[PDB]
Symmetry: none
Subunit: 138 residues, 3 copies
């Protein structure tokens, strides 16, 4: 049931990250298209992450088609707000997780999640001035 269970992660772990941290769905889609598109349409997945991303992108496209249709119906403002609040967060979270895992590695994403949770659970007095501003180490 857990989409992250295959990769060793759980929603219990990802609950540490606030929703606002995740970038917009458009940005994640742009990053995926720029980086791993040719892998996505490759006949061979080469990774479970590729299959997961393909399924997620298709589901997001179906959701966008449904949103456009319900916009044609009648009203779409509250509907799209709802999809952003509930579906939007889950999809952007999953896409960010998969893109990060492809970029750096599943385990690297794991300790990054752990460190970010440690930082956020730390009160500001004890807390470092800046959260780990994630960037690949050259």
């Amino acid at each position: 049931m857990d989409p992250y269970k295959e990769f060793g992660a759980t929603v219990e772990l990802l609950s540490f990250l606030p929703s606002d941290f995740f970038p917009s769905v458009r940005d994640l889609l742009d990053t995926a298209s720029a980086l791993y598109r040719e892998a996505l349409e490759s006949p061979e997945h080469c990774s479970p992450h590729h299959t997961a991303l393909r399924q997620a992108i298709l589901c997001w496209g179906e959701l966008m088609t449904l949103a456009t249709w319900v916009g044609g119906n009648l009203s779409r403002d509250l509907v799209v707000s709802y999809v952003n609040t509930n579906m939007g967060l889950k999809f952007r979270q999953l896409l960010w997780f998969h893109i990060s895992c492809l970029t750096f590695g599943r385990e690297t994403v794991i300790e990054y999640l752990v460190s970010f949770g440690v930082w956020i659970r730390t009160p500001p007095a004890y807390r470092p001035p800046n959260a780990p501003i994630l960037s690949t180490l050259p």
Copy 2:
């Protein structure tokens, strides 16, 4: 961007068969839950078919959640007919394809699909009336 391209099949290939041939979504969900529930709850995917099934089930559940919301939030029946119209067919087709691949094998599904397609398509203008009986086997 083609769900079946990794699995060899194409959307046209599954479009060879009539849309109504695919069973109800609820029956497919019951079949998956009875057959491969513990497999899909495993911490490891064990196959691309499994992973795609995980995301398909999650997507269907989330879409049904949105359907309940829109039933409670702003045309109540037009949207729930539309979900069954186009993308609901996509879920049922995808679920049937993946369940069949997991049960009888990918190539068995492919050959069964093409067999029923050639069973149906050919015009009887000078096609002999001798037509065998459709069947599916493991």
Copy 3:
């Protein structure tokens, strides 16, 4: 510790078979008496199936005893319909499962169950004209 854990199957697996498929309980009793009566008589089992069948038979006899008692003691004769339609269906399902496992083999019963589920899921238009009419195959 599933009621079919040592038998491999699950109740959800038996959920596919419609209730009408399972024959009347009298037929199952006659089949058991004709085939495995002498095996059941000995306190030694020769198989877990024999022990399970003996327990089911004893419980079912107790159920007729209680049904007749309630007809006499304590809708007095309407409760027989209640008990049959509520758990006599489960009892006959279990009896059919065990008899079929004894005769054809447990695993053979398994693929018969999955094939019958696939058949019944198929809409009648493209469904094979006959369901697998399971008899004692050579």
